[PDB]
């Protein structure tokens with residue numbers, strides 16, 4: 001009951017900032033997560049024993065892939081933590097509980113391949129789940145782990161609170177399919193601009209949480225440049241392995257996944273900032289003004305990739 005987690009002084013201070021990097025010491029990441037649950041949600045939100053067992057089961061069900069790994073899970077969760085701590089009064093008790101768990105579970109059992117590669121491979125998950133293939137899988141693995149003996153961290157909720165929290169989690173994990181972000185952001189853009197955006201409208205909160213999930217998922221682009229640059233190496237190690245696997249199916253991969261086109265990475269990152277990242281953080285900042293440091297870090301990183309093209313680095 002009175003067992004708090006504490007962090008060294010540097011981490012206690014820097015964990016509050018959007019641009020925090022969780023560091024290379026894997027054994028500290030469960031503790032960093034519990035710390036965030038406890039400040040975000042409260043020391044009563046979960047039974048510590050059930051939570052520690054849930055976290056360790058989630059970790060075991062992420063694979064040893066270059067980018068879509070346990071570190072990505074804890075990083076995305078930390079960006080959610082910073083969003084929620086900077087918008088105290090805007091979110092319900094169930095929403096703070098649900099979203100930190102959703103972010104931790106959002107890529108469970110990722111293999112390092114896109115929805116597109118699963119469909120071209122004709123993988124069994126593509127017949128089970130014809131759209132948002134990996135995301136429906138991630139949600140499935142989340143419910144499986146929640147149903148393991150001693151792992152139901154939501155057990156103290158009523159039946160309706162429990163259906164509510166699992167529904168928040170399901171929508172938040174599905175929203176991490178980037179294919180769905182384009183239209184979600186366009187709708188929020190129109191709603192903010194015609195002044196019809198209403199946080200008391202459930203369909204509207206759902207869209208805002210979806211954008212939050214995209215913002216947290218893509219938060220590599222919001223770190224200090226040395227972090228963003230080194231994470232891009234892990235991002236491309238996965239993409240280039242998928243490209244190689246496309247060539248094995250007798251399919252030319254898109255340039256993003258062709259290692260033979262490594263030279264054009266700096267121009268490809270610019271397109272992504274301009275088409276996905278900058279628009280994402282701009283709309284989030286319009287709806288939730290205290291998330292502005294994410295937009296400001298993203299712009300700094302865009303300007304660093306423009307410097308790479310000019311051969312200043």
Ligand SMILES: CCN(C)C(=O)c1cnn(C)c1C(=O)Nc1ccn2cc(-c3cccc(OCCF)c3)nc2n1
Pocket residue numbers: 178217218219220221232235255256257261262263264265266267268269271272
């Ligand atoms: C954290 C997100 N992040 C940083 C990401 O990259 C990220 C995370 N998830 N996803 C899906 C992305 C993403 O879509 N990234 C892209 C998009 C388009 N690209 C094109 C290229 C590219 C690369 C080399 C040569 C080239 O030549 C084009 C001319 F032939 C183009 N590289 C891209 N990278």
Ligand SMILES: [Mg+2]
Pocket residue numbers: 106107134176177
């Ligand atoms: Mg994903």
Ligand SMILES: [Zn+2]
Pocket residue numbers: 072076106107176217
């Ligand atoms: Zn992810």
